[PDB]
């Protein structure tokens, strides 16, 4: 159920995308130290070309990361039918990256009501489809 929590703006000027990353909580340690290095791997999906990807930094042993990046893509029209995807992950020095949590927004959501504030971090399957925002709570 709970794999924290991130804040996050999104909104659409000029046939471009806009993104700030501002930071996560409470997320759930992966690692043998109890912590996590967490990174946000951002993408447009569909790509099929893996020609979207863009990521944080890493941020070395903490649950509560202060990423403060901020990221732009330009779109395209085949965009309309397009999701941004955002995705917390673990990089591991030793193992495959560890999935922490993730959400997405509508391309065509953001142009009418861009995203600003809380959301609730999902499952990898789940967050590829829609996004819960925790308002004032
Ligand atoms: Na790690």
Redesign the pocket.
């Known amino acids: 159920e709970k794999r924290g929590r991130i804040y996050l703006k999104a909104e659409v000027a000029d046939e471009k995308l806009h993104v700030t990353v501002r930071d996560a909580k409470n997320l759930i340690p992966?690692?043998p130290n109890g912590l996590?290095?967490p990174y946000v791997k951002l993408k447009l999906i569909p790509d099929p070309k893996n020609e979207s990807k863009q990521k944080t930094k890493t941020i070395r042993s903490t649950l509560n990361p202060q990423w403060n990046e901020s990221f732009t893509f330009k779109l395209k029209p085949s965009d309309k039918d397009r999701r941004l995807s955002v995705e917390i992950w673990?990089?591991?020095?030793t193992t495959r990256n560890?999935f922490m949590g993730s959400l997405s927004f509508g391309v065509s959501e953001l142009m009418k009501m861009p995203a600003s504030g809380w959301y609730k971090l999902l499952n990898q399957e789940e967050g590829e489809y829609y996004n819960v925002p925790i308002p004032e709570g």
Do not use: E, P, Q
């Open positions: 992966m690692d996590s290095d673990d990089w591991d020095r560890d």
